[PDB]
Amino acid sequence: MSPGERFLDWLKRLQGQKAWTAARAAFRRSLAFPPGAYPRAMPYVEPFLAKGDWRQEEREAHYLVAALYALKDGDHQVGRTLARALWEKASASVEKRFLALLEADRDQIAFRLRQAVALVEGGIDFARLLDDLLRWFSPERHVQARWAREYYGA
Amino acid sequence: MSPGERFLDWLKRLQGQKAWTAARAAFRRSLAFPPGAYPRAMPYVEPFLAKGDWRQEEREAHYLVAALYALKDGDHQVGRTLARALWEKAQGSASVEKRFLALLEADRDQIAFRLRQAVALVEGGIDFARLLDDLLRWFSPERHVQARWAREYYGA
């Protein structure tokens, strides 16, 4: 059972509860900020986080995914990765956006990632998104490679 | 067709196309990074790769050959292999034979750097198709490619 899958489970269960309303507003509000730097969003994520040992970029990855999930309003389509979604939205100009995503550094990744999620139509697999973001920064650049195969695979 | 054959073909179509200028620069820029980890070079290669099933190292080989081909502005001459060319160059310098040997023993971390360095060293065209085919099988346990390379070099 993947860390991405677990989180999505946590996020899904969260959406059915009464708190979803405040939570969603909190997640959506957090985009203005660096992931994990918005306290309102914190009650919703920190408890899930307490179970593991997470390095900082890992918490950020979780917080980011929660916000993006909130954007798509819980719209999680399994099997459909963002890269594929990005391909499906076309278009030449998009192909620049997708590459620009791959070359993003920690500074720009959340923003570019956010901009990219708003753009696609439908839902994307958020469990996949988290597992992929968790390993985004290996020196090998293997995740980015797979996204390429995914995007150009379509 | 061999895989090196099919790729070289692809590269050649690319060269006689308006995009070539940009691709040449993108492939050149990529030498600064590990093969396949440079996004701006992607558009030129992934569409080709998508039509096949490749292990990562195999995918990496293509990217490397693509950058090397660009480094030499497409100067490809069938039958003139990298080893033969390195030999020919070595009549001019004894320094070369030393470099070729280090190339031969190259491991996964060194192969890109040493290959690049060796390709720049030679004069004339080399057979890029044969090169890709060789690169793909570089890590075979029986070391067939390296042996053949030693044959070409010390059999000249």
Coordinates of C-alpha atoms in Angstrom, one line a residue:
Chain A
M1 CA 0.0 0.0 0.0
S2 CA 1.5 3.2 -1.4
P3 CA 1.9 6.4 0.6
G4 CA 0.0 8.2 -2.2
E5 CA -2.8 5.8 -1.9
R6 CA -3.1 6.1 1.9
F7 CA -3.2 9.8 1.8
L8 CA -5.9 9.8 -0.8
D9 CA -7.8 7.6 1.4
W10 CA -7.4 10.1 4.2
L11 CA -8.4 12.9 1.9
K12 CA -11.5 11.0 0.6
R13 CA -12.7 10.2 4.0
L14 CA -12.2 13.8 5.0
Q15 CA -14.5 15.0 2.2
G16 CA -17.6 13.2 3.4
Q17 CA -17.4 14.8 6.9
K18 CA -18.9 18.1 7.9
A19 CA -15.5 19.7 8.2
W20 CA -15.0 19.4 4.4
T21 CA -16.4 22.8 3.9
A22 CA -14.0 24.7 6.1
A23 CA -11.2 22.3 5.1
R24 CA -11.7 22.9 1.4
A25 CA -11.7 26.6 1.8
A26 CA -8.5 26.2 3.9
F27 CA -6.8 24.1 1.2
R28 CA -7.8 26.4 -1.5
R29 CA -6.6 29.4 0.5
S30 CA -3.2 27.7 1.0
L31 CA -2.3 28.0 -2.6
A32 CA -1.4 31.6 -2.0
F33 CA 1.2 30.2 0.3
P34 CA 4.1 27.8 0.5
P35 CA 2.9 24.4 1.3
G36 CA 2.7 23.7 5.1
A37 CA 3.0 27.4 5.9
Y38 CA -0.7 27.9 6.2
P39 CA -1.9 27.1 9.7
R40 CA -5.6 26.8 8.9
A41 CA -4.9 23.9 6.7
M42 CA -2.9 22.3 9.4
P43 CA -5.6 20.5 11.4
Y44 CA -6.5 18.5 8.4
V45 CA -3.1 17.3 7.4
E46 CA -1.0 17.3 10.6
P47 CA -2.8 14.3 12.1
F48 CA -2.2 12.2 9.1
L49 CA 1.4 13.2 9.1
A50 CA 2.0 12.3 12.7
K51 CA 1.9 8.6 11.8
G52 CA 5.1 8.7 9.7
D53 CA 8.6 10.1 9.7
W54 CA 8.6 12.7 7.0
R55 CA 11.3 14.9 5.7
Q56 CA 10.3 18.5 5.1
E57 CA 9.9 18.3 1.3
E58 CA 7.7 15.3 2.0
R59 CA 5.2 17.2 4.2
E60 CA 5.2 19.9 1.6
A61 CA 4.3 17.3 -1.0
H62 CA 1.4 16.2 1.1
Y63 CA 0.2 19.6 1.7
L64 CA 0.5 20.5 -1.9
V65 CA -1.5 17.5 -3.0
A66 CA -4.3 18.3 -0.5
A67 CA -4.6 21.8 -1.9
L68 CA -4.6 20.6 -5.5
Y69 CA -7.1 18.0 -4.6
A70 CA -9.2 20.7 -3.1
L71 CA -9.0 22.7 -6.3
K72 CA -10.3 19.8 -8.4
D73 CA -12.9 19.6 -5.7
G74 CA -12.0 16.0 -4.8
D75 CA -12.2 15.0 -8.5
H76 CA -9.9 12.1 -8.5
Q77 CA -9.8 9.9 -11.5
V78 CA -7.6 6.9 -11.0
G79 CA -5.3 5.8 -13.7
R80 CA -5.3 9.2 -15.3
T81 CA -2.0 10.8 -14.4
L82 CA -1.5 14.5 -14.8
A83 CA 1.0 14.1 -17.6
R84 CA -1.6 12.2 -19.6
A85 CA -4.2 14.8 -18.7
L86 CA -1.8 17.5 -19.9
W87 CA -1.4 15.7 -23.2
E88 CA -5.1 15.3 -23.6
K89 CA -5.7 19.0 -23.3
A90 CA -4.4 19.2 -27.0
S91 CA -1.6 21.9 -28.5
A92 CA 2.0 22.9 -28.8
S93 CA 1.8 25.6 -26.2
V94 CA 0.9 23.0 -23.6
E95 CA 4.0 21.0 -24.5
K96 CA 6.0 23.9 -23.3
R97 CA 4.0 24.0 -20.0
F98 CA 4.7 20.3 -19.5
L99 CA 8.4 20.5 -20.1
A100 CA 8.5 23.6 -17.9
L101 CA 7.0 21.4 -15.3
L102 CA 9.9 18.9 -15.5
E103 CA 12.6 21.5 -15.2
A104 CA 11.0 23.2 -12.2
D105 CA 13.0 23.5 -9.0
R106 CA 11.7 23.5 -5.5
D107 CA 11.0 27.2 -5.9
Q108 CA 8.7 26.9 -8.9
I109 CA 7.3 23.4 -8.6
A110 CA 4.4 24.2 -6.5
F111 CA 3.3 27.1 -8.6
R112 CA 3.8 25.4 -11.9
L113 CA 2.2 22.3 -10.5
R114 CA -0.8 24.3 -9.4
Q115 CA -1.1 26.1 -12.7
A116 CA -0.9 22.8 -14.5
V117 CA -3.7 21.2 -12.4
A118 CA -6.2 24.0 -12.9
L119 CA -5.7 23.6 -16.7
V120 CA -6.5 20.1 -17.2
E121 CA -10.1 18.9 -17.7
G122 CA -11.5 16.2 -15.6
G123 CA -9.7 14.5 -12.7
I124 CA -6.3 13.1 -12.3
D125 CA -5.0 10.4 -10.1
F126 CA -3.9 12.1 -6.9
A127 CA -2.6 8.9 -5.3
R128 CA -0.1 8.7 -8.2
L129 CA 0.6 12.4 -8.0
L130 CA 1.7 12.2 -4.4
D131 CA 3.9 9.1 -4.9
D132 CA 5.5 10.9 -7.8
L133 CA 6.0 14.1 -5.9
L134 CA 7.5 12.3 -3.1
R135 CA 10.3 11.1 -5.4
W136 CA 10.5 14.1 -7.6
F137 CA 14.0 15.2 -6.6
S138 CA 16.1 12.1 -7.0
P139 CA 19.2 13.0 -9.0
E140 CA 18.2 10.4 -11.6
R141 CA 15.1 12.3 -12.5
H142 CA 13.2 9.0 -13.0
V143 CA 9.8 10.3 -12.2
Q144 CA 10.1 13.1 -14.7
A145 CA 11.2 10.4 -17.2
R146 CA 8.0 8.5 -16.7
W147 CA 5.9 11.5 -17.1
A148 CA 7.5 12.0 -20.4
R149 CA 6.7 8.5 -21.4
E150 CA 3.3 9.1 -20.1
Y151 CA 2.7 12.4 -21.9
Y152 CA 4.4 11.3 -25.2
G153 CA 2.8 7.9 -24.8
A154 CA -0.7 9.3 -25.4
Chain B
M1 CA 16.8 -2.4 -39.6
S2 CA 18.9 -2.4 -36.5
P3 CA 17.9 0.1 -33.7
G4 CA 20.9 2.3 -34.3
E5 CA 19.8 2.2 -37.9
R6 CA 16.3 3.3 -37.2
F7 CA 17.5 6.1 -34.9
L8 CA 20.1 7.5 -37.2
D9 CA 17.4 7.7 -39.8
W10 CA 15.2 9.7 -37.4
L11 CA 18.0 12.0 -36.6
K12 CA 18.8 12.6 -40.3
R13 CA 15.1 13.5 -41.0
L14 CA 15.4 15.9 -38.1
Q15 CA 18.5 17.5 -39.5
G16 CA 16.9 18.3 -42.9
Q17 CA 14.1 20.1 -41.1
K18 CA 13.6 23.6 -39.9
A19 CA 13.6 22.4 -36.2
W20 CA 17.2 21.2 -36.6
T21 CA 18.8 24.4 -35.5
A22 CA 16.9 24.3 -32.2
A23 CA 17.4 20.6 -31.7
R24 CA 21.1 20.8 -32.3
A25 CA 21.3 23.4 -29.5
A26 CA 19.1 21.4 -27.3
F27 CA 21.1 18.2 -27.8
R28 CA 24.3 20.2 -27.3
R29 CA 23.0 21.7 -24.0
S30 CA 22.1 18.3 -22.7
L31 CA 25.7 17.1 -22.5
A32 CA 25.9 19.0 -19.3
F33 CA 23.4 16.7 -17.7
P34 CA 22.8 13.0 -17.5
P35 CA 21.2 11.5 -20.4
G36 CA 17.4 11.7 -20.4
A37 CA 17.3 14.1 -17.5
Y38 CA 17.2 17.2 -19.7
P39 CA 13.7 18.2 -20.7
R40 CA 14.3 20.6 -23.6
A41 CA 15.8 17.7 -25.5
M42 CA 12.7 15.6 -25.0
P43 CA 10.5 16.7 -27.8
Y44 CA 13.0 15.6 -30.3
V45 CA 13.4 12.1 -28.9
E46 CA 10.4 10.9 -26.9
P47 CA 8.0 10.6 -29.9
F48 CA 10.5 8.2 -31.4
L49 CA 10.9 6.3 -28.2
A50 CA 7.2 5.9 -27.7
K51 CA 6.9 3.5 -30.6
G52 CA 9.0 0.9 -28.8
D53 CA 9.6 -0.6 -25.4
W54 CA 12.8 0.5 -23.7
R55 CA 14.6 -0.1 -20.5
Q56 CA 15.8 3.1 -19.0
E57 CA 19.4 2.5 -19.8
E58 CA 18.4 1.8 -23.4
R59 CA 16.5 5.1 -23.4
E60 CA 19.6 6.7 -22.1
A61 CA 21.7 5.4 -24.9
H62 CA 19.5 7.1 -27.5
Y63 CA 19.8 10.4 -25.8
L64 CA 23.5 10.1 -25.6
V65 CA 23.9 9.2 -29.2
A66 CA 21.6 12.0 -30.1
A67 CA 23.8 14.6 -28.3
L68 CA 27.0 13.2 -29.7
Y69 CA 25.5 13.3 -33.2
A70 CA 24.7 16.9 -32.7
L71 CA 28.1 17.6 -31.3
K72 CA 29.4 16.5 -34.6
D73 CA 26.7 18.3 -36.5
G74 CA 25.5 15.0 -37.9
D75 CA 28.8 13.9 -39.4
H76 CA 28.0 10.2 -39.8
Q77 CA 30.0 7.9 -42.0
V78 CA 28.9 4.4 -42.2
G79 CA 31.6 1.8 -41.5
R80 CA 33.9 4.3 -39.7
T81 CA 33.5 3.2 -36.1
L82 CA 34.5 5.2 -33.1
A83 CA 37.3 2.7 -32.3
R84 CA 38.7 2.8 -35.8
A85 CA 38.6 6.6 -35.7
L86 CA 40.2 6.7 -32.3
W87 CA 42.9 4.5 -33.7
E88 CA 43.5 6.7 -36.7
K89 CA 43.7 9.7 -34.5
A90 CA 46.2 7.9 -32.3
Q91 CA 48.9 7.9 -34.9
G92 CA 49.0 11.6 -34.2
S93 CA 48.9 11.2 -30.4
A94 CA 49.9 8.3 -28.0
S95 CA 47.6 10.0 -25.5
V96 CA 44.6 8.6 -27.4
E97 CA 45.3 4.9 -26.8
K98 CA 45.2 5.7 -23.2
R99 CA 41.9 7.4 -23.5
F100 CA 40.4 4.5 -25.5
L101 CA 41.3 2.1 -22.8
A102 CA 39.7 4.1 -20.2
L103 CA 36.7 4.3 -22.5
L104 CA 36.7 0.5 -22.7
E105 CA 36.6 0.0 -19.0
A106 CA 34.0 2.6 -18.5
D107 CA 31.2 1.9 -16.1
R108 CA 27.7 3.3 -15.8
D109 CA 28.8 6.5 -14.1
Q110 CA 31.8 7.1 -16.5
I111 CA 30.5 6.0 -19.8
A112 CA 28.8 9.2 -20.7
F113 CA 31.7 11.4 -19.9
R114 CA 34.4 9.3 -21.5
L115 CA 32.3 8.6 -24.6
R116 CA 31.7 12.3 -25.1
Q117 CA 35.4 13.1 -24.6
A118 CA 36.4 10.4 -27.0
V119 CA 34.0 11.4 -29.8
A120 CA 35.2 15.0 -29.7
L121 CA 38.7 13.8 -30.1
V122 CA 38.3 12.2 -33.4
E123 CA 38.4 13.7 -36.9
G124 CA 35.9 12.9 -39.6
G125 CA 32.6 11.1 -39.5
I126 CA 31.8 8.0 -37.5
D127 CA 29.1 5.4 -37.7
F128 CA 26.5 6.6 -35.3
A129 CA 24.1 3.7 -36.1
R130 CA 26.7 1.2 -35.1
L131 CA 27.4 3.4 -32.1
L132 CA 23.9 3.2 -30.7
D133 CA 23.7 -0.5 -31.3
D134 CA 26.9 -0.9 -29.4
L135 CA 25.9 1.4 -26.6
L136 CA 22.8 -0.6 -26.1
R137 CA 24.7 -3.8 -25.5
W138 CA 27.5 -2.2 -23.6
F139 CA 26.6 -3.7 -20.4
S140 CA 26.2 -7.3 -21.5
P141 CA 28.0 -9.6 -19.1
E142 CA 30.0 -11.2 -21.8
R143 CA 31.4 -7.9 -22.9
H144 CA 30.9 -8.5 -26.5
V145 CA 31.0 -4.9 -27.6
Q146 CA 34.2 -4.0 -25.8
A147 CA 35.9 -7.0 -27.2
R148 CA 34.9 -6.1 -30.7
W149 CA 36.1 -2.6 -30.0
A150 CA 39.5 -4.0 -29.0
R151 CA 39.6 -6.0 -32.2
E152 CA 38.9 -2.9 -34.4
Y153 CA 41.4 -0.8 -32.6
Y154 CA 44.3 -3.3 -32.3
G155 CA 43.4 -5.1 -35.5
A156 CA 44.0 -2.0 -37.6

